[PDB]
Each structure stands twice: as C-alpha cells, then as structure tokens.
Symmetry: C3
Subunit: 594 residues, 3 copies
C-alpha cells in the first residue's frame, strides 16, 4: 500500500509512523517520533484555524481562544507546561467565558497547567477603557463557590504588556494574574509593564490558599492616569506566601499619590529583597476582618526585610479592622534591614512621608519589631516621620534603626487622638542631622495622643538642632502613665526646652523621666557646708538632680547633686570657703525615679 | 529498495533517516530527526518491557529499574537531564542493588545526571514498615570508601510522596535524597510529602562535599507515628552549603515533640528565608567530633537568618562534642532577623520552649551573635525562655532582640550546673509584657549555673510585672566574677526584690552592679548639714547610691547621694532646716563600681 | 514521484514533509515535524562544516564561529534560547570580529538571545598570555557609541573554564561576561573557574543599564599569578542591579592580596546572601565621578547584607571621588547581617584587616548604617579593625554589631589626617575579648585624625584588657568638638588610662564626656560635714564626678559626688564623724555635661 504509506507520512499521523529509539540504544523504548514530540507542547499546537492551518499571531489576531484551548487540553491530561514562544507577540483581544466572566477574565488558569512565557503577551485595544483580569484561577463568578487552583506556575523571560490603556472609570478593576483560591502557585521571572491597573498579581482569596509566591518579577509603569483609583502591585491574600527579589518601578505622578508595591494580608507572609522606585507606599501589613474566612482573623508572622525603596508616602503601613461579626488582629510583625528614602519632592506634595504609619480606617496592632532599618528624607520635606502614629496602637518596638527625617514620632494635633500602648523607642535608635535647623516651632517627638501607657522614649541626639521647640512634647490633653521618657544631655546644653509636659504629666506616680534644665539657685550665707535652693518651686516631682555645668568660682561651690522639698524647691549641700549668699544659674539633669 | 525504505522508516532507525535543517537555514547543520530528539531524554525512553514496548506507569508497575537504566545510560555519555514527565505518577516498588544497598537505597544518583521531576514519584506498599533512602549518591555501602557525587541537580514542579507508611521500628532510617560525598548538588522546587521519615534530604557526609543547596522546596507532613525516633528535615553535613527559601510544615502531634527543620553541622553553612510550622525545633547548629573528617573539627561561619517559625520546643540549638581522639568546636555564628513563636500549647506539654538552647550531650561554643530577632510565647507557657542555658557556654552575645516569653535566661535548678563565660545581654534587648502577672515564685533571669564570668546582663523592663520574685537571681552555689549586672529602675519602684545575690556575690572585687532597693535611714539631730545613715549594715559593697524618691518634707531633706562606711552602713549628707532626728524610708539606686 | 518522495524524506527538508498533530488531537494544529523541532535550537544546529556535516567539539576544534552563527541567526528571528549541550566541552580558539574586537571579545551577545549553558565552555591555549572577554554585549569598540544589550540571560548547570592560563602582562584585561550597556540581563547557575582574570562578570557601563543580576553562580580560582594586577569578581556598573546567593572562592596567595568579590558602583545596587573564601576584599561600594554618565553622580541605596566571608584584607570599602567636571557622592548605604572573619595569617602579611575601610584615592561619604554584623580576627593579627578610617568621612553609623579584633577605630599616625564628621558608635556595639592582653602600647579607639566633629563614641567593654594603653586616645593634633565620648566603667577599675585627650580637648564647650579616673583627695580637719579637695588641679573641665570605690573607713566618709572649682580642683562634701585631715585615693567617674 505504498501510495497509502506516502499519504500516511504526509498526513497529521505521519510522525506516529516514523520509529525512534534514543541514541540508537537497543535497551531503550521503541517509540514513534510523535511520542517524543508529544513530551512538549506550545501555543503553536493550538493556534490554528478550523481547518488546522497555523495562524501567525499579531495585532489583528486574537490569540485568546487558542491559549484557552491549549490550557483546557493539557488540563485534561493531568497537567504539564505550555510554552508561549519567544520571538513573537501574542495579542489578547476578547473576554473569556464561563466562571471567569464575573471577574472580567481573559484566560482561565487550570490546576497543574504551567505557563512558560518566553514571548510577549499584549492586550489589544478592545480593552481600552475597560476592566480586565488577564489570567484568572477562579472557576466560578462567586469566589465563595469557586474550586481551588493548585500547582500552577507562570514563569520565563517573557512579558505581559497591558497596552498602555487608561482606566475608563475609577470603579473598574484591572489585574494581571489572579490565582484565586490558590495553593502552590507562583510567578517567576516575568516582566509586567505599560499599564493602568489595580494590581499586577493577587494571591489567594480571603485567606484561602497557601504557598503562593512572586519571585524575580519586574513591575514597570503600571499606573498612568488620574482615573485610576488605587494600585497595589501584589496583593497577598493567602498564608505561607510572599514576594521576594522583585523590582517595582513607576514613573507617573499619579503613582506617587496612589501606588503601593505589596499588601501582606494573611499570616506567615513575607516581602523581601526587593527594590521599589516611584511608588507612594512600600507595603501594607493588615488584617481585614472581611478577609478572615480562609485562615482566621489574625495576621501574625509578617515579615518585611532587606528591601530597598524610594517612595513618596509611607514605607510600611500597619492596620486592622472589624466587621459586625469578626475582629481582625495584627501581631507578630518584623520590619528589618530595609533601606528607604522619601524621593525628592516639595513638602506636603504627596501623602505624609513615614517609615511606619499606623493607618486609620477598633484596631488591634501589637508585638511589632522594627529593627536595623535606615530611613532618610531630604531636609525640605517637613512631612517626614519615623512613625506617623495616627490611630490606636497596642504595641510597636523600635531598636537600632537610623532615622534621618523631620520628626521621630508624629501625629497631627486635632486630627485623631490615638490611644497608645507599649510604644518602645530604645536608645539605640540613631537620630540623623539632615533636618537640623529646619525645626522652628516643631517638636521632634510630637506626642499628639489621647494617652500614652507602658511606653518608652529614650531620646539620644547625635548633633545639635537648636531650631526645634523641644525634643519631646506632651500636650495637656495626653494622659501619660507607667512610662519612661529620657532625654540624653548630649548636644542639648543650649536648648531652652528639652522635654515638655504641658499638663505636668511627668509628676505621675509611675512616670520615670530625666531631662536637662536650667535652674537658678540661691544659697544661705553660712560659711562652710551650706544649702543651695532653687528660686522656682516647679520641682516637687524631682527625685534627684545633678550638675551639668562647671563651677567658675574659687570661693564656693554649688552642690553636685540635689533632692527636692515639699514646696517644690530643689535643695542641695554645697560649700562656702568664705561665707556670703550665692546666686548661680546651673544646667542640671533633672531625674524622677531613674 | 523501496520496501526496505518503508521498513526502515517504520523501524526504530526511521527517525535517523528523515533529514532536518533548522528553520530551513541553509547555513545550519544537515541533521536527522533522531539527532534533534536525542538532545532530550525522559523516563519514557527507558520505561519499556524487554521487547521495547512502552509500559504505562501506575500502582501495579515498579518504575525503579527503568529510571535506574535511564540514569546509568545518561551517565555513560557524560551527563544530561532526565525528565520525569508531568501528568503521571511513577511508583517505586523495590530496592536498588550494589553500592546503594547498604543505605537501603532505591535509586542511585550519578555525577552530572540531573533529574527534572515534573510528575509525581510515589512509594508503593512494598516499603510499608521498612527503611528506605529514595535517592542515594553514595557508590559504596561504606561511605568512607565511596566515590563522590558531583554536579547532580534535582528540580522541577513535581513531588516525592512517601506513601504515608509508618516506620516499622524506631531503629530504622528513612531519607528522600542522600547526596553522599556531594559536590555541587542541589534540590530546587520539589515538594516532599506524606511520610514518616528520619530526613527528607541530607547533604554531604561527615564534612566531605561542598556547594550543596536546598532551595524553594516544600516539606509537608513527614512525621506521622509514635514509632519514628527522630526527624530532621534537612541535614547539612558539608561546608559551603545551605537551605534557603523553603517551606516546612507538620501536622502530627509526634512532630511537635521530635521534629527539627534543619541541621547545620559544617562550616560556612546557612539557613535563610524559610517558613516553619508545626515542628519541635527550628535548627541545630552543631559540630560533632564524629563528623569532622572532611572539613575539620570547627563549625564556623554558621548563619540562621530571616526565617519565620511556629515551633513547640527550641528555635536554635547550639552544641559541640568530643570523641577520644577529636574535639569539636562551634564558633562564629549569627542568628538574625528571625521571627519565631511557640505555638499554642499547654505548659510543659512539649520540650521546653526557647529561642536559643545550649544543648547538653566537654562543649566549646563561643563567638555567637544573636541580633534583631523576635520571639513570642503565649502567656500560659511557663516553659518559655529567650535562652535555656543548660550546658557549658564559652560565649554568646544578644543585641537588639525583642523577647516576649516567661524567662529571659533560664536553667533548671539541680539539673545541670553549667559553667558560663562571656554571656552578653545588651540593654537594647527589649523584654515584652505578655507574661506579666504570671511570674509568681519566678526569677526573670534565673541564673542557675555553677559559675558566671566575663558576663553582662543589662535588665531593662518595658512594663511592670510585680508578680515576679526578682528580675535576676543568683543562687549561692553560682560563683560570679568579672561581670556587669544592672537593673534599670523603670517600672521597678514597687518591686521588693530587683537583683538577688543569695551568696552576696555582688561584693566581688570585679563585679560591677547597680539595682534599686528600699533603704531606711536615720539622721543625727544637728541643725544644718547633717548625716543620714542606713539602719541596716548590708551595704559594705556599695560604692555610691542615689535617691529615686521624692522628699515630702519641708523642714529637712535627706542626702541626694550616699557612700558607705566600713560597718556596711550607707552615709550621706542632708540638710536639717530645723534640727531633730529624722527617719525616712527611701528608694535608692545602689551602685557598685558603676 | 515516489523516487522524489524518498529523496525528499532523506533530504534536509524531509522533516518538513512528515505531518504531526499534538497527541492525535483533532483540534490541534496540523504541523510538520520540522515545525516542532524548530521550537528549540542548540549549538548542534550551527556546529557544522561548509558542507553541512556536523563537527564534534574538542580541544582541536574552535567552536567560536559556530556559536556566533547561532547567536546571529536567533537574533534575526527576535530572539530565543540557544542550548550549549551537556556531555560536551566546547572550546573557544580565536577572537571575534567587529564591534567586540576593541574589547578583546570572543563571542558577541545579542538582545533577546539567551544562552542555556549545560555543557562546558573552555578556552584553548590560543589565549594563553593574552587578554580576552569571553562574552561581550557591546556592539561598538567605543562603549559611548554602543547600542544596548537587552533581555539577555545566561543560565544552566554548566561551566565557563578559563583554561588556567596566566596573564601575559599586568596591563591586560580579562573578563567572562561583559554585558555592556545592559538592560534586563542576568547570569544564573553558572560556574566560572580556573583562571587568571580581572573580572568574571561586569554589568552595565558607566551607569548605563538597569535590572542586571548575578544569582546562584560560583566563582572558583580566578586569580593564579603574580602578573595579575587586580581582580574584582563582579563589577556592578548599572543601577537597580545586584548579586545574590553566589559563592566565591580563591586558593591563590596572590588573591589574598589583590582580589575583591564585588564592586557596587551605581545606585540601588545590592550584594546579598553570598559566601566568600580566600579573597582580600568583600566589596567596594564606590561612586567614581568618571562612571557617572548613565545614572548620575550619586551612589545611593547601596546594600550589603547577610553575606558570609573569610577574607584577608577589608570587608566593605567605602569611597568616592571627583574629576575636573564631576563630583561623585556616596550616601544611603546599609551593611547588615554579615558574618565575617579575617583568615588565619601573620600580622601585616596582607592588606590591613577591617570590617569597614574608608579608602583613600575630595570624598563625600555619608548616611551609612552598619548594623547587626559580626567580625572576628584571630588574636595575633595586630592589623585588624572594625573601621580603618583612612580618608575623609562625612558620616557613618554603627549600631548593634559584635566586633572582635585588635582595634575598634583605627588610622595610622602620620599617614593621612582624615577630617571626620558624624561618626556614630552606639553603646550597643559589643567589643569582643579575643585580643585581650595583646594590646601593649595600643589604643583601642586610636583617633588619629585631623579633626572629629558631631561624633559619638560610647565605649563599652565586655571583659578586661589591662594591656591596652587606653580605651580611646585623641592626639593633640586632632581637634574635637560637638561630640560625645564615654567610657563605661565596667571592667575598667584597674586601668591607668581610660580616655586620653593629649590636647586637653575634652574641655571644649560642646564636648560631652565621661570616663573613669583615680583621684587623690585631702579634707579639712573639721568635724562634721567637711570638704574634700583634689590634690591635682587638672579638673577645670569636670561638671560632676561620683565615687566608684568603697569607703573602708568607719570614722569618716568622702563625698559621694563632686563638682569643681576655678583652679581645677574637684570639691565635694563628706562627713567626719571625728575630726582630722583625711587623705584618700578614690576611683571616680569624671563627667562633663553628661
Ligand atoms: C488597591 C488595593 O489593593 N488597595 C488596598 C486596599 O484594598 C481594598 O481596596 C481595593 C481597591 O481596589 C480592593 O477592593 C476592590 O476589589 C474588591 C474585590 O474584587 C472583587 O472580588 C474579586 C475576587 C473579583 O475578581 C472581582 O471581580 C470583584 O468581585 C471589590 O470587592 C471592591 O469593591 C473593590 O473596591 C480590595 O479588595 C480585595 O482585593 C483582593 C485582591 O483582588 C481580594 O483578594 C480580596 O477579596 C478583596 N477584599 C475584599 C474585602 O473584598 C480591598 O481590600 C486595602 O483595604 C488597604 C488597606 O489599608 C486600609 O485599611 C487598613 C485597615 O483598616 C488601614 O490601617 C489603612 O489605613 C487603610 O488604608 O490597602 C490598599 O489601599
Ligand atoms: C534525625 C537527626 O538528624 N537528628 C539529629 C542528631 O543526629 C544523630 O542522630 C540521627 C538519628 O537519626 C542520625 O543517626 C542515625 O544515622 C546514622 C547515619 O546513618 C548511617 O550512615 C549513613 C551515611 C547511611 O546512609 C546509613 O545507612 C547508615 O549507615 C547512624 O550511624 C546512626 O546509628 C543512626 O542513629 C545522625 O547521624 C548522621 O546522619 C547524617 C545524615 O544522614 C550523616 O551525614 C552523618 O554521617 C551521621 N553522623 C554520624 C556521626 O554517624 C546522628 O548524628 C544530632 O546528633 C542532634 C544534635 O544535637 C545533639 O548533639 C549536640 C552536640 O552534643 C547537643 O548540643 C544537643 O543537645 C544534642 O541533642 O540533632 C538531631 O537530633
Ligand atoms: C579590578 C577592579 O575592578 N578594581 C576596582 C577598581 O576599578 C578600576 O580599576 C580596574 C582595573 O582593572 C578597571 O580599570 C581597567 O579597565 C578599564 C575599563 O576597560 C575599558 O573599558 C571597557 C568597557 C572595555 O571593555 C575595555 O576593553 C577597555 O576599553 C580601563 O579603562 C582601565 O585602563 C583599566 O585599568 C576599572 O575600570 C572600570 O571597569 C568597569 C568594568 O569593566 C567598567 O564598567 C568601567 O567603565 C571602568 N571604569 C572606568 C572609569 O574606566 C577601574 O574603575 C576601582 O577603581 C577600585 C575602587 O576603589 C578605589 O577608589 C575608591 C574611590 O576613590 C577609593 O575609596 C578606594 O580606596 C580605591 O581603591 O576598586 C577596585 O580596585
Ligand atoms: Na466579580
Ligand atoms: Na515588640
Ligand atoms: Na486624653
Ligand atoms: Na548503611
Ligand atoms: Na559574640
Ligand atoms: Na559553683
Ligand atoms: Na577596549
Ligand atoms: Na547613618
Ligand atoms: Na588637626
């Protein structure tokens, strides 16, 4: 049948008739060529017209149904990896159908079906002014009724290009990859670019999912208009999941005001080793009660480490909230090894610059460690703080950071009156000098709170700034109890005010406080050991004080150390070599219970 | 010969007769189809019966000999990568033969032969109740006589499933990958699951090997029975080797009592960026003298950083030991950036909770830096410590950590009496408040040692805990010399005991100590400058003291500062505006040589 | 035409006549075998003689033109990935031509053309004694006229072997991969070995380039002769670029004196997670004004974290410089989590050992944070320092490090006289004890500078070292102002000198200083409250002092605290129970404005 043989060979079954054995090894399987070819699969195997003839991709070709067919087919065989070939741009030109339609989905991902994107995937103008989620892992329009997406990995050296199209309306949503209720899924190596989107990738769905990761990806120019309501490049909404070694860049002015790189919203999540430029915000670390279904109502074991950022707003934002029925809690957080600066901008030209923000809208944030970070803002940016503490806080600890910005602790007066507990600012935090001389009328630690309890503020300057009103100021409206507040004397000799308690709160029974002050004293006339007393009676709270001044006199000396008396004078015993009433003005370290 | 031509084409040599040139490029090599196919290799090329017909894998098919044949064949050509295809589960049903038999080996790995596991590898019930090591890189039953395994990489999106089978006896061993005397080997991307094993991966053999790594792997439910004697998921037994970005999870109760994620046992080894849940222990960092053959008897440059863990026992365990002939030493260790909690459990229901443990069974551990970590244990877990110091220590330094647990330093009285040198607890360690009010009868730093030398403990509270017996207590049995022990006054005003030296050890010539105390004093009756003396004679050791109390009196003041006298009284000079014997009880900061 | 059919099949077009459809799927594209084969490409498709017959690689075969042809061809189709097959060594035996010739180039890389190196690439002896750059991404002999290289990735399990050939002359250059003006390029997984080269990889060109990375690579024995002038394994000369998780090893003696692992020379660059053995230096972090064209004249956001190193010289070297026209600035640097030791060597046998060096040859270095690192040098290495501060510094901050070496701060007297600003050494830096008893004639902090301003040095010992001359010494030639210098008393009771100011600089108006001293005092004879005065008149600068000694006497007590008098005596009020002139020698804490 040698006519039939030639016909068979040229037919689509022809490769199934040509035998093969690996490297002529007689111990190897006797196969057909088609068997070996069938070990791999690409978009070319599905990118064909109804008569089976291949179609070249391009801007007038909608590749969506072909990729979907490929995905569908490989899913039917228990999975595999589909290559999107290099050297070609594959345009997407229509919405998907079925369970992804509720999500404005283009492509449905399926379990165990990996995409090796080596070429480029580009959105056609069909999508201009419309919502879209390019890859969707949900299988139901209602995520609560969705099955899971498992073991789906997107990787390669290729690109997803969003076509530069602006949002049509603020209320729209746009996404690159929504993995859905996603278990062991990942994106590695891909560049996402040239868009106006809400997110590039989302992981999980309200706590459902596990072991999802974004690694070695680039995210470039993904906000481009004033219509875009909000952008967060990666939203991590399942536990045991994270972002590592990624690069995030924006150029748009709008991004400086609206864009965040990462959301960590479930327990055991991380954001590491990544570089951010041009964004408003670095990361939110948040437990929303509305997202607590899959993994509980606590966000714990949250890690933000070893990132590099230039931002215009706030680096890390901490928060939690409630619904009628569920209480969200954020605890057990570490922020460490990050090097962050506020980019060159005018004061008040973007959201208030901060390393840590305690974001408003019942919060419960505690057990946070912020350690071994650097923060810098240029000297003109009045709105820059180590922490903007703008809502209730139940604990945050700062150790061994270097903060070089306008404020250390700040909240705006007569906005919120946060209730503050367990704010620990260790003496090993180094306060930079870039804003020296810029602080007229300002308090370095401006404690504009309802109350402060169980808190520690150990102020240590590293250079002079005599422009500042005070190192630390508590308004009379702020209650202060069971706290330690100290101001180290270095670089403070010429300051009129070091610590200010406008409500005399430092007299509290369990307030432990020390700071420098200038005190005028007068002695009795007695020759010999002689008392010196303060002229003012403002010191009923002082347990001891000691001299920070030299004694220019030969004929007498004031006391080295002082106690107080019931009338609020200080008193100490000096020495009159010759008698006479003495009158001196001395710099003292005032101490209370320390 | 056109009959012969058709026959040739359908034969196993047929692809070797069909010509090919890349993309019709006339400058390309004129090849045959078989040449291009021979560029890749899969298990399908060896998974055949004796007549060459392919065999489908499945639970009634033992794939072992076929994979071994593939490995053997590729090794003969100088190496390559064998694909274990996606969409299939490949069952292993028998032991291997030869040099791996001594190791209970299933598959022998060979140098330069990589395995790309995209499908699933599952153990058949043949292995129920038996020992096994799935992949073995030794080529001799005696590892000391083994050749090396070099340049062998196992990677992909696939899975090794251990079939859920329990151990048959405690004395058995079970492993996933033993690389052997392994140089430039790695496992990346693989999920190891559903087992009862000793290890999932071991790297090296008693110091022999180099540049072995486990990256982006998952390890899930690898302990399931009470028979399992001990589990450590990755054992690193060669230098210049490590674990990074991995995920470790257990669900079994037995795992909470026996399972550790990593062993770092040779120099220049690391454990980074990984997430652990459900394990007893995080990592051992140990030099066993018995393992010192390949790389010397020092474990140095050991790094445990930026991990996330929920454990039930101890995070990092430090140790070393000796044989008759060889002395093991552990030095130059860093533990940093880790965020760790003891999981919800009853007190004493698992091994004692600790961030650092100094593990018993001559140790030599020194030059350890523990910095910028968080640790948390729930308030009910009495058995929780920043360090359980249960064997000899030659040095460990703690700086800028946040420890929130029951004890800071602990050892059980009348177990061991460790000899302690160079324990440094810097003031920048922040002590959390979760266990406040839980510490009746307990010492926060319970120094239950034979001796303490060249040590620093700078206690700083961040909130009150008046339940505790003391901040720090030394029993009379503990010698204390050439040390600094300080208790900051903040939050201590109402404590009866701050530091306790049951053997009066704070009087030592080179002991530098300060802590608060209440002292009753009486003055002479003299008007004017007047001495006040303590009623008790317990202060022969005090170099100075100063007031931590206000003076409620108008008519006199006690001294601000005090020295001592030979009889052990304190003495200072106050001021009697009017004469009369005065009697006061004051809170003082007692100081010795500081 | 069945003769023609058989002929066609055996021809190079034969595979283009054999039909295929994926897995017999009738919905799949009807293709030819050649179409599926054309989805991949290897060196075999170009490694052929002029008649198209394949050539086997080997030491007598020059593979260069064949690889270049492959690269060229794939570039023409918009890119792809070329495999360099496993199981073969591919020798390079000649220079390339054209635009790479100016760079001594062998292979020209092209945009979007990736190289998957699974086999070995070896240099033939043609290259002995000659310069070479194996892979070059420039397209012009003058880099300023070069186009860019974009989207080029080199990866796999293979090896580049430099053939062991020595340099022929010091003035020559040799490189593995020069990416050129390189945007989104990377090298992953490759081992570079057995050479005498200047660099293994360079990224960027004078600030031009972006998003270039070296990951999971090994670099082994890349210096082997005394001819080699200088070696730096990776030179990062574009922003948003870095090195992570790499391994660097040298065995040569010459490497201990000349070799550095990484250069970070542009903003937003990083060096993380890597292990170094046998090198002189870890990393330079430098802004050269001569390299400022592409990305500006500031190196900012520079990160060196979580590395492991054994080196013989300096870990991190900081610098900047100028040209006639351009000023380079280095700022916003973090160095954190690194564990580093000086390898076993004789004192002065290699460049001076240091954790941080401020390298000479107008510098501008500021806003540097050095935190949470360990450093160790063996006790014999006299030339070991936490910082060698050998050129001008505008700021560096040290917090919570553990430095165990001979010096903390050092500069050699009568070499440079650096101008120092904003040097911050926080009290949380722990000073190790390995060099105790080795410091005869040495100052632990040897402040051999022109001047020191706005600086903080808080010395805290952790053990005794009475061998040292002083803890800190300022020569009379060093101006000191607006600074804080403190020496904690612990472990200092027996020291003759703690802080030394050879120019009496501690008297400065804005110098804040405290340290211990022994002081002889004499009292008046008066019974009762009685003054004690120092016999020496060296204390005009002291604001207060207090006792660090016990009082062995019953009949009197010296003052607990002292002030001074205009003549430079100290004075305080003690108590004579019985009268008589008293004479005591006491250890005091001397304080000035603190
Ligand atoms: C851009 C971004 O992520 N911003 C963060 C805030 O997130 C919140 O606003 C977003 C605005 O885009 C999201 O809401 C929008 O999308 C919702 C979800 O889309 C639906 O469900 C999807 C699964 C389908 O595919 C879609 O087709 C659609 O059906 C939609 O319901 C909203 O109407 C719309 O506005 C974001 O919603 C979350 O999206 C993730 C990712 O897709 C998804 O997994 C979640 O299910 C979904 N959550 C919920 C509850 O629906 C929404 O959360 C974020 O709130 C803010 C955190 O900071 C604030 O709150 C802190 C705690 O009080 C406080 O401290 C802080 O100061 C506050 O600013 O951070 C970013 O702004
Ligand atoms: C599970 C685990 O790793 N536990 C750690 C302890 O390791 C020790 O016990 C293990 C129990 O499973 C291992 O011993 C077992 O296996 C030995 C080796 O198997 C043989 O050799 C292999 C190469 C072959 O393939 C096998 O067929 C067989 O011939 C076997 O000899 C023992 O009888 C058996 O109990 C573990 O042994 C090491 O295994 C690694 C990995 O396979 C291998 O590379 C080494 O060669 C082998 N070492 C030796 C010396 O044989 C064995 O080390 C670990 O000791 C402990 C550390 O903490 C303790 O010690 C500290 C220092 O004193 C102390 O501070 C601390 O408090 C102590 O708890 O940590 C885990 O428990
Ligand atoms: C080995 C190394 O990298 N050493 C570091 C120092 O770099 C400087 O010396 C190098 C010696 O090899 C390089 O100069 C050499 O190469 C130059 C460039 O080659 C040319 O241009 C290439 C693009 C072509 O392919 C070549 O064919 C050739 O045309 C050449 O011009 C020089 O003559 C030659 O000596 C190195 O030069 C840089 O090389 C990189 C990587 O290839 C390239 O991207 C740059 O363009 C090129 N730069 C310049 C300006 O040409 C050259 O920089 C390095 O200077 C030192 C830093 O520390 C010192 O300076 C600090 C600041 O003052 C100071 O604090 C510190 O104490 C100092 O030691 O670090 C290493 O030693
Ligand atoms: Na929807
Ligand atoms: Na905390
Ligand atoms: Na209030
Ligand atoms: Na054995
Ligand atoms: Na240490
Ligand atoms: Na004892
Ligand atoms: Na050149
Ligand atoms: Na700094
Ligand atoms: Na000078």
């Amino acid at each position: 049948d040698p006519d039939q043989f030639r016909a068979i060979i040229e037919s689509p079954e022809g490769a199934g008739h040509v035998g093969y054995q690996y490297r002529r090894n007689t111990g190897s399987t006797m196969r057909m060529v088609s068997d070996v070819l069938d070990e791999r699969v690409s978009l070319w195997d599905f990118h064909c017209d109804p008569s089976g003839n291949v179609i070249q991709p391009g801007p007038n070709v909608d590749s969506r149904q072909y990729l979907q067919a490929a995905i569908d087919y490989v899913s039917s065989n228990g999975g595999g990896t589909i290559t999107i070939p290099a050297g070609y741009t594959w345009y997407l030109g229509s919405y998907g159908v079925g369970g992804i339609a509720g999500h404005s989905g283009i492509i449905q991902l399926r379990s165990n079906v990996n995409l090796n994107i080596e070429g480029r995937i580009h959105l056609s103008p069909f999508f201009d002014l419309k919502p879209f989620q390019v890859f969707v892992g949900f299988d139901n329009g209602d995520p609560a009724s969705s099955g899971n997406l498992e073991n789906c990995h997107i990787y390669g050296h290729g690109v997803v290009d969003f076509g530069g199209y602006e949002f049509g309306a603020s209320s729209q949503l746009r996404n690159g990859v929504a993995f859905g209720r996603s278990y062991n899924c990942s994106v590695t190596g891909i560049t996402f670019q040239n868009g106006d989107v809400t997110w590039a990738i989302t992981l999980g769905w309200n706590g459902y999912g596990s072991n999802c990761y974004v690694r070695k990806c680039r995210f470039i120019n993904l906000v481009n208009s004033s219509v875009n309501a909000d952008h967060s490049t990666v939203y991590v909404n399942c536990p045991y999941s994270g972002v590592e070694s990624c690069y995030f860049s924006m150029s748009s002015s709008f991004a400086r005001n609206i864009a965040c790189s990462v959301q960590l919203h479930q327990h055991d999540t991380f954001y590491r080793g990544s570089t951010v430029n041009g964004y408003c915000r670095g990361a939110y670390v948040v437990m929303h009660a509305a997202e607590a279904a899959g993994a509980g109502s606590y966000a714990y074991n949250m890690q933000v480490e070893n990132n590099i950022a230039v931002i215009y707003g706030q680096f890390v934002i901490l928060g939690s909230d409630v619904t009628a029925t569920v209480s969200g809690h954020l605890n057990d957080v570490i922020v460490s090894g990050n090097i962050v600066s506020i980019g060159e901008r005018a004061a008040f030209s973007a959201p208030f610059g901060a390393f840590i923000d305690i974001g408003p809208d019942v919060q419960d944030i505690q057990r946070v460690l912020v350690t071994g970070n650097s923060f810098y803002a240029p000297a003109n940016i009045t709105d820059s703080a180590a922490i903007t503490l703008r809502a209730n806080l139940n604990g945050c600890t700062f150790i061994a950071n270097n903060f070089d910005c306008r404020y250390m602790v700040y909240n705006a007066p007569g906005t919120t009156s946060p209730v503050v507990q367990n704010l620990v600012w260790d003496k090993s935090n180094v306060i930079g000098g870039t804003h020296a001389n810029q602080r007229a009328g300002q308090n370095l630690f401006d404690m504009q709170f309802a109350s402060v309890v169980n808190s520690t503020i150990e102020v240590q300057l590293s250079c002079e700034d005599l422009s500042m009103f005070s190192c630390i100021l508590f308004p009379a409206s702020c209650q202060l109890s069971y706290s330690k507040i100290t101001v180290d004397s270095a670089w403070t000799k010429s300051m009129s005010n070091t610590a200010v308690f406008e409500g005399n709160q430092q007299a509290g029974a369990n307030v432990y406080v020390s700071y420098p002050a200038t005190v005028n004293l007068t002695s009795y006339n007695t020759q010999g050991a002689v008392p010196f007393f303060s002229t003012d009676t403002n010191y009923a709270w002082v347990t001891s004080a000691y001299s920070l001044s030299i004694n220019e006199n030969l004929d007498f000396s004031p006391p080295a150390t002082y106690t107080n008396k019931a009338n609020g004078q200080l008193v100490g015993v000096g020495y009159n070599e010759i008698g006479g009433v003495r009158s001196v003005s001395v710099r003292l370290m005032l101490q209370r219970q320390v």
